[PDB]
C-alpha cells in the first residue's frame, strides 16, 4: 500500500533497481529487485542517513541510525535501522534481492524515504568482525553504487 | 532547520545541484543552487510526483499536485504544489537558482522529500500559453535532468 523505489548507480557500471513495499505502517517492508555489475559474493547493503548524492555516494553519510544503536545484521535487535545486511552476486555479477524487514518503514521515524541506499565493495560482517569498525560500518568497504529512495506510484 | 538537496542528472550535458532549506514548518522554503549545461533562456522547473528514476526522468510522472489544481506559476494561487516556474540559463548555459516558495514544504501534505525535481527543455508558460496543455504541463517540453529530493545534513 506504500511503494518506494531506488535506482542504484555507480562505476562499473554497478547498477540496480530496488523496490520497497509496505502493506500497513505497522507491518514489514518487502524489498526486491536486482543489481548487476558486482563481483561474486557478499556486498553490504545499507540505508545511509542522507539522501545527498551531490558528491556521489560519500555525501550519504553514515548508516541510518535514528535510534542510536550499534551496527548489526538485519536479524539482530542491536542494529541500525539502515542495516539490511548483504546482497549476494552470482558469477555473472548479478544480485537478485529479496528481503523482508520489520525495522525499516515507509512511514514514521523509521522511514527511509529521502535517504540513500548503498551497495558496498565487500561483505558486511554484521557487527561480528571483532574490531571497532565492525560495530559502526560492518567493514563493508567502499560504496559501489547508491541512489536516493523515492516515492513510487 | 530542515535541509534537503537534489542532484539533477539526465541523458545529456545538463547537471545541477539544488538545495532547499526551511527554517520553520510554517515558513517559506529557500531554494538555491546551480544547473549547468542548459541552453540560454528559460527552462521549466518542477517537482514531479514520483521519486522514481527507473527509466530516467519520464518515470517521475506528472507535476506534484496533491490539491488537484491546474498548472500555474509559483506566484499564482492556481498552481500545482510542484510549480516552481522557470530557471534562467545565461550565455554560458548556467542557471543560478534563487527561489523562495511558500507552497512547497519539507514537511506535511506539501512535503517534497522523495519526489523528483525536473528541469525542462523549454520555458514553462506558467499556464498562460493559450492551449489545454498549458494548464497541465505549461508546455515545457522534454525532461533534461532530474533527481530525487533527499534529506541533507
Ligand atoms: Se516517511 C517520511 C520520510 C521523510 C520525511 C518524513 C516522513 C514522515 O512521514 N514523517 C512522519 C509522518 C507522520 C508521522 C510521523 C512522521
Ligand atoms: Se515530509 C514527507 C516525505 C515523504 C513521505 C512522507 C512525508 C510526510 O511527512 N508525510 C506527512 C506527514 C504528516 C502530515 C502529512 C504528510
Ligand atoms: Cl559505510
Ligand atoms: Cl512535464
Ligand atoms: Zn549499520
Ligand atoms: Zn504544474
Give me the residue spans of the domains in chain B.
1-153
Q: Which atom of ligand 2 is nearest to the CA of B113?
A: 3
Q: Is B21 on the interface with A (CB under 8 A)?
A: no
Judge contact between B112 and A148, C-beta under 8 A: no
Q: Is A62 on the interface with B (CB under 8 A)?
A: no
Place of cell 542528472: B9
**Among protein residues, the one whose CA lies closest to atom 4 of ligand 1:** A113
Rounded to whole angstroms, the maximal C-alpha distance in chain B is 43
Q: Is B46 a catalytic residue?
A: yes
Exposed / middle / buried, residue B131 (Cβ in 10 Å: 0-12, 13-18, 19+): exposed
Give the closest ligand to the alpha carbon of residue A134: 5
* Active-site residue, from A43, A79, A80, A115: A80
The answer for B 68-127 residues in CB contact with A (under 8 A) is 113-116
Q: Is B16 on the interface with A (CB under 8 A)?
A: no
Judge contact between B51 and B114, C-beta under 8 A: yes
Q: Where are the alpha helices (DSSP H) in B90-149?
A: none
Q: Give the binding-site residues of ligand 1, using a 6 Å CB cut-off.
A: A 107-108, 111, 113-114; B 113
Round the CA-based radius of gyration of chain A to a whole number and report it: 14
Domain A1-153 in this protein, CATH class: mainly beta
**Among protein residues, the one whose CA lies closest to atom 4 of ligand 2:** B113
Whole-angstrom Cα distance, residue B123 to residue B144?
12
Judge contact between B128 and B106, C-beta under 8 A: no
- Residue B29, phi then psi, degrees to nearest 5: -105, 125
* Residue B41: its H or E element: strand B41-48
- Smallest Cα distance from B113 to chain A, Å: 6
How long is chain B?
Answer: 153
Assign residue A112 a region: left if phi > 0, alpha if psi is -120 to 50, beta otherwise?
alpha
Q: Which three cell numbers stand for residue B15?
A: 547537471
Question: Can you list the positions of beta strands (E) in chain A?
Answer: 2-10, 14-22, 29-36, 41-48, 54-57, 83-89, 95-101, 116-120, 143-148, 150-151
Place of cell 517537482: B47
Q: What is the resolution of this structure in A?
A: 1.5
Q: Which atom of ligand 1 is nearest to the CA of A113?
A: 3
Task: Establish whether residue B113 lines the binding site of ligand 2, counting it when its CB lies within 6 angstroms of any ligand atom.
Answer: yes
Residues of B in contact with A5 (CB under 8 A): 50-54
Decide: helix, strand or coil at residue B120.
Answer: strand
* Active-site residue, from B71, B79, B110, B115: B71
If you count residue pairs, one on A and one on B, with CB atoms under 8 Å apart, how many are there?
A: 83
Contact residues for A116 (Cβ-Cβ < 8 A; gap 6+): A47, A48, A49, A50, A51, A52, A53, A57, A60, A146, A147, A148, A149, B150
Is the dihedral angle over the CA atoms A131, A81, A13, A87 positive or is it negative?
positive
**Among protein residues, the one whose CA lies closest to atom 10 of ligand 1:** A108
Across-strand partners of B70? none
The DSSP secondary-structure symbol of B81 reads T
The DSSP secondary-structure symbol of B9 reads B
- Residue A41, phi then psi, degrees to nearest 5: 120, -165
Measured in angstroms, how far is the CA atom of residue B62 from the centroid of ligand 4?
Answer: 6
Q: Is B43 a catalytic residue?
A: no
CB contact under 8 A, A153 and B113: no
Residues of B in contact with A53 (CB under 8 A): 7, 147, 150
Omega cis (within 30) before A13: yes
Whole-angstrom Cα distance, residue B71 to residue A147?
29
Across-strand partners of B21? B3, B30
- β-strands B41-48, B29-36 pairing: unpaired
Place of cell 555489475: A37
Amino acid at each position: 500500500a506504500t511503494k518506494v523505489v531506488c535506482v542504484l548507480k555507480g562505476d562499473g557500471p554497478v547498477q540496480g533497481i530496488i523496490n520497497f513495499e509496505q502493506k500497513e505502517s505497522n507491518g514489514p517492508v518487502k524489498v526486491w529487485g536486482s543489481i548487476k555489475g558486482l563481483t561474486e559474493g557478499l556486498h553490504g547493503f545499507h540505508v545511509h542517513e542522507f539522501g545527498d548524492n551531490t558528491a556521489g555516494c560519500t555525501s550519504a553519510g553514515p548508516h541510518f541510525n535514528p535510534l542510536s544503536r550499534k551496527h548489526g545484521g538485519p536479524k539482530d535487535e542491536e542494529r541500525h535501522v539502515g542495516d539490511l545486511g548483504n546482497v549476494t552476486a552470482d558469477k555473472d555479477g548479478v544480485a537478485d534481492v529479496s528481503i523482508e524487514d520489520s525495522v525499516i518503514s515507509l512511514s514514521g521515524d523509521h522511514c527511509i524515504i529521502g535517504r540513500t541506499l548503498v551497495v558496498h565493495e565487500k561483505a558486511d560482517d554484521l557487527g561480528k568482525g571483532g574490531n571497532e569498525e565492525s560495530t559502526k560500518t560492518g567493514n563493508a568497504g567502499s560504496r559501489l553504487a547508491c541512489g536516493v529512495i523515492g516515492i513510487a506510484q
